[PDB]
Assembly symmetry: C2
Homo-oligomer: 101 residues x 2
């Protein structure tokens, strides 16, 4: 369950950051989880260096020592707005995940 | 400086987690930094949902909501071990970065 995989949850369209206020619930899918199984020699050494405190913190976010769990395919989310007009946002919801990079 | 880019530092071979203990340092390069401007519509909605606490937490790590800063190219690293034998690991060090999302 902690490993990289497709996740999903019903959420209101208004929470999607699309500028709409509809309370209609739509199933939003996304990717999250560990990708340690797909780590390369570079990744393992980076992980070891960080674990040993051998690396000085570069400016900004910490280096990721493994591929990131990201969508490999997407599908559109559609809904009716306040005027009963159909709206569609293409490729907004994930349909598959992978350990990329 | 906080944006995704190639980083570099001299590090002890012993800290690379290779099992081989050397005594010289090697130049190790990696990638780290932000990719916010590279967010896709999916990433933006995921970020909107996470920002509002609209998603229950999936087991393990939180989903990433922007491409990850990862290497796009690598190079070998070689070093002489404590018994005077040269060792090498292909593609151990990064030579270029990209916002892989």
């Amino acid at each position: 369950a902690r490993g990289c995989r497709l996740r999903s949850q019903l959420v209101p369209v208004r929470a999607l950051g699309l500028g709409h206020r509809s309370d209609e619930l739509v199933r939003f899918r996304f990717c999250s989880g560990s990708c340690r199984r797909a780590r390369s020699p570079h990744d393992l050494s980076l992980a070891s260096l960080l674990g040993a405190g051998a690396l000085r913190p570069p400016p900004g976010s910490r280096p990721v020592s493994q591929p990131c769990c990201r969508p490999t395919r997407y599908e559109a989310v559609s809904f009716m707005d306040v005027n009963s007009t159909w709206r569609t946002v293409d490729r907004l919801s994930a349909t598959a995940c992978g350990c990329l990079g």
